[PDB]
Write a protein that binds this DNA or RNA. Structure first.
Ligand code: MG
Ligand code: MG
Lengths: 222, 171, 51, 159, 58, 185
RNA sequence: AAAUAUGUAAGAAGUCCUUGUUACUUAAUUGAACGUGGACAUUUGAAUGAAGAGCUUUUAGUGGGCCAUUUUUGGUAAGCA
RNA sequence: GAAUACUGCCAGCUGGGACUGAGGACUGCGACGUAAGUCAAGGAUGCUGGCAUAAUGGUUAUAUGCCGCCCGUCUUGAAAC
């Protein structure tokens, strides 16, 4: 019973088919991302050419970052922040956009900054600060074996599969999002850009919905 | 901030009783898209019975200046709230573009009447196509034939904390 | 024992994602788009330039 | 001194209403309650017997006992830091069936009908309710709907 | 030497420390307060049902 | 700062590694913590948790309870397991030929069991006979039969046994207990 | 006649079919309540989160409070009540 | 018919600076290689100089920069005139 060569070679081969499946899946995801965004651009161009207006779909995903600290919070926004898992300043979470979640975001408007994340900032968040919740422990991802062990029941095999499930809000978004530990970001590297934070972003402050400017803030804080 | 001009076109949400609402359009000076859409919904809530939950925005487009290197005279009609009431004013500004003209307008109102961005309403801004329709002396002063003037008392800021000669303010 | 970070450290980047090698090979980060000659309508441009 | 009687602060609560005073109609006597029905409590000031207390006005409970002219209802009352169980004997003029329960039962029977008809094909029934999703892409046209430009209106007195 | 008369300050915090736990509901709730003419017949009905089931699965 | 949703640093509240200083009990919990770690049978974890228990959480199990448990059908040849002590009962007259594994046996219970043809077995012999609890039956004594739980939760309209030293007439049978003297509870 | 607060429901202890008990009830196997047997399972019946869930015993200290935003009472007012 | 600005992306390249080197046979995931093997791939190694002593360091006194109200108690509140 040598047991160090045959099983090792079988394990290496099995990893080779796993790597091939991950490679072709990522090729398909890249193709569908670029065709989707180019189709949106061409649809806007054709609407302009025909003289109509192209109203694009409302975004189905937000990223929410807690901005205010933990002292002096009223109980209803405090409970909503605990239910959205924002128990620390500079902590972020993806939220699927629904009326039921928009009412929570309206409740905790003065203590968060949220917006519509892009593929680049989602990829940078999961790649740099990527932590899974494995039997109530915070485990860094760092290898696809962890992700296919814990989310492989729901089809997710790799980190880019998890990224795809986040960005295209699929059938198992809830499972993927609860598998993801809340993101612990730092303070922004270039500052907040405003002299005073706790006004609305429309008022020249920081809280509220900076609907597409959240990518700059999150990339500075990440 | 440094202002940009947008057109914002929106409408009410379509119902079965009335599809195709009337697609209202407005021109907003704002820092970005979020502030532009917020000001759009603010003025439509002042005008018609609609709000953001009951309506939608079909288009937002930046309108940059057609001739950004032509020197124009603009007449601007403005509402502002003072500490005791609401007043209408007409000010005219000689400047090269609409966004810069309304930037100097906001600075002028904040300087001379202590009126804030939340208090100023921009009724309209329009280029005055003909001279002698200019009605203010402070801009009619710069429309004379062969305008030239000197700049007395030049002050040159120094980089060193010590200067080795008495400076001159000749220009 | 130590979290090595992708987006630097191309070894662990290739460990997580095999597609990154052919992404860098084909240069899909800088991909040239196909040009279309569509022109907007006159009603669109006059609505844009309307005062 | 202070006054906390049984019907204190019940003035507008136990007024009848505008222009529907007088005797009560016979549907409240013809309605049938069974044990386990879920009922709303709203007192009728015209009937002084079997009246609920002012706490239970607008409360919803479960029938546990049926007698000759009254109904026993179970309410959960918050006392301090827990809920206690309260049993009330109320005449049937002060109760009516809760409509949310019958709406939910209609959803149950229509849901079972959908599952039963779609079990013959296996077409991913998707029986859970979903909330208001964000509205998707659309193309709005300007044929007969050219945009109208609006401006803020100047100030006037209007008196 | 007057003093504070009454307040409800801190009371909801004290309540929500250990929560407002909902009471535990059970299958077969208590039959006290139910009508005695109903219970007197219900006893005989269950006795006959138990005898019939015992004779069926004896 | 963290907005804590729970109490930090709290113990689990479940007793491990029992408070007794009995060296043979420590040997037994060593054997059964090995078995619970590696035999992946739920029986070993159950008896390992039962080995930690205090005296009032280990009530005695009578031979009448053992015989009543053996009269369940399909359970005549099972091995009875009592993590605790086994006392006898003179209220029963016939006893089957069982095997009973327990911590302690009283003299009467051991005499009854070996007189009926059965056998008394310790927990380590139980472990070497059935490492994964094959064909066993765990019995537990009645916890709520103690004298102390009579007075637990005493209050009005509870019927819950006042803490009293002397009983009889004129020892708490008066005002507050009959309506002829004031009220009734 | 609002806004904010507030009760209940969103299933398996459920739904449907068939027929057993009774001293209750009905003109009447009519109904009431509890049942036998059978069918419906992971989108099992909205969202989000769960950090374990539930239960018991015993005992300490405390039972002078005060301040801020908002609502508000007496007072001309108060760092007043 | 172009350019440029603005915004955004690159699993594009590359220069300078600071702090950290935890762990201690091997095991894992990978990469470059046909292969042997190699590697920046589950945490620092290689080369060199000076000194080998009060030189670094410890202790203690002093000086300097910034900070620091008297303890215990009652109290809503104590450095309390
Ligand atoms: Mg504040
Ligand atoms: Mg600041």
């Amino acid at each position: 019973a040598e047991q160090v060569a045959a099983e090792r070679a079988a394990r290496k081969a099995a990893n080779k088919e796993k790597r091939a499946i991950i490679l072709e899946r990522n090729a398909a995801y890249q193709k569908e991302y670029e065709t989707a965004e180019r189709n949106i651009i061409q649809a806007k161009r054709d609407a302009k050419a025909a003289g109509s207006y192209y109203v694009e779909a409302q975004h189905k995903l937000v990223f929410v970052v807690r901005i205010k600290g933990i002292n002096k919070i009223p109980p209803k926004p405090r409970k909503v922040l605990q239910l959205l898992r924002l128990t620390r300043i500079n902590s972020g979470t993806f939220v699927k956009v629904t009326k039921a979640t928009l009412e929570l975001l309206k409740l905790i408007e003065p203590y968060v900054a949220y917006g519509y994340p892009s593929y680049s900032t989602i990829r940078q968040l999961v790649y740099k600060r990527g932590f899974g919740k494995i039997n109530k422990q915070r485990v860094p991802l760092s290898d696809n074996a962890i992700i296919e062990a814990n989310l492989g029941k729901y089809g997710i095999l790799s980190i880019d599969d998890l990224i795809h499930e986040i960005i295209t809000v699929g059938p198992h978004f809830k499972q993927a999002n609860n598998f993801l530990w809340p993101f612990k970001l730092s303070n922004p590297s270039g500052g907040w850009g405003v002299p005073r934070k706790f006004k609305h972003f429309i008022q020249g402050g920081s809280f509220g919905n900076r609907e597409e400017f959240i990518n700059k803030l999150v990339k500075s804080m990440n | 901030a440094h202002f940009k001009e947008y057109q914002v076109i929106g409408r009410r949400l379509p119902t079965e009783s009335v599809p195709e609402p009337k697609l209202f359009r407005m021109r907003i000076f704002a820092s970005n898209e979020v502030i532009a859409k917020s000001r759009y919904w603010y003025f439509l809530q002042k005008l018609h019975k609609v709000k953001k939950a009951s309506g939608e925005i079909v288009s937002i487009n930046q309108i940059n200046e057609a001739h950004p290197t032509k020197v124009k005279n603009f007449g601007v009609w403005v509402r502002y709230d003072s500490r005791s009431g609401t007043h209408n004013m007409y000010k005219e500004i000689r400047d090269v573009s609409r966004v810069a003209a309304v930037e100097t307008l906001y600075q002028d109102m904040a300087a001379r009447h202590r009126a804030r961005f939340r208090s100023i309403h921009i009724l309209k801004v329009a280029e005055i196509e003909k001279t002698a329709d200019v009605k203010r002396q402070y801009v009619k002063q710069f429309l004379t034939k062969d305008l030239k003037f000197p700049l007395p008392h030049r002050v040159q800021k120094s980089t060193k904390t010590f200067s080795y000669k008495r400076p001159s303010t000749f220009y | 024992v130590l979290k090595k970070n992708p987006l630097k450290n191309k070894q662990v980047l290739l460990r997580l994602n095999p597609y990154a090698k052919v992404f860098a090979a084909e240069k899909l980060g800088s991909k040239k788009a196909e040009k279309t000659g569509t022109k907007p309508a006159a009603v669109f441009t006059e609505t844009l330039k309307h005062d | 001194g202070k006054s906390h009687g049984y019907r204190s602060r019940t003035r507008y609560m136990f007024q009848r209403d505008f222009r529907k005073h007088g005797a009560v109609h016979l549907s409240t006597y013809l309605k049938v309650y069974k044990v386990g029905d879920i009922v709303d409590i709203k007192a009728n000031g015209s009937i002084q017997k079997g009246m609920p207390h002012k706490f239970y006005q607008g409360k919803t409970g479960v029938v546990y006992n049926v007698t000759k002219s009254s109904v026993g209802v179970i309410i959960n009352k918050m006392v301090g830091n827990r809920y206690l169980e309260k049993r009330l004997n109320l005449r049937v003029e002060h109760i009516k069936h809760s409509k949310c329960r019958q709406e939910f039962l209609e959803r149950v029977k229509a849901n079972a009908a959908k599952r039963a008809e779609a079990k013959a094909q296996g077409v991913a029934v998707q029986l859970k309710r979903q909330p208001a999703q964000p509205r998707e892409s659309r193309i709005v046209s300007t044929e007969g709907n050219v945009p109208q430009t609006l401006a803020p209106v100047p100030y006037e007195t209007f008196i | 030497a007057k003093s504070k008369n009454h307040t409800a300050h801190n009371q909801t915090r004290k309540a929500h420390r250990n929560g407002i736990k909902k009471p535990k509901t059970y299958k077969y709730p208590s039959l006290k307060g139910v009508d005695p003419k109903f219970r007197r017949n219900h006893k005989h009905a269950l006795h006959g049902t138990a005898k019939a089931l015992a004779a069926a699965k004896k | 700062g963290i907005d804590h949703t729970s109490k930090q640093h709290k113990r689990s509240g479940h007793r491990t590694a029992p408070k007794s200083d009995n060296v043979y009990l420590k040997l037994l919990v060593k054997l059964y913590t090995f078995l619970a770690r590696r035999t992946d049978a739920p029986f070993n974890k159950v008896v390992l948790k039962a080995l930690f228990l205090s005296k009032i959480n280990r009530p005695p199990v009578s031979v009448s309870r053992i015989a009543r448990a053996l009269k369940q059908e399909g359970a005549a040849n099972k091995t009875v397991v009592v993590v605790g002590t086994v006392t006898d009962d003179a209220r029963i007259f016939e006893f089957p030929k069982t095997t009973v594994a327990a911590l302690r046996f009283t003299a009467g219970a051991r005499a009854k069991i070996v007189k009926a043809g059965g056998e008394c077995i310790t927990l380590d012999q139980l472990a070497v006979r059935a490492p994964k609890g094959q064909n066993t039956l765990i019995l537990r004594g009645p916890r709520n039969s103690r004298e102390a739980v009579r007075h637990f939760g005493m209050g009005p309209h509870k019927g819950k046994a006042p803490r009293i030293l002397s009983t009889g007439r004129k020892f708490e049978r008066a005002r507050g207990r009959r309506r002829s003297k004031g009220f009734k509870v």
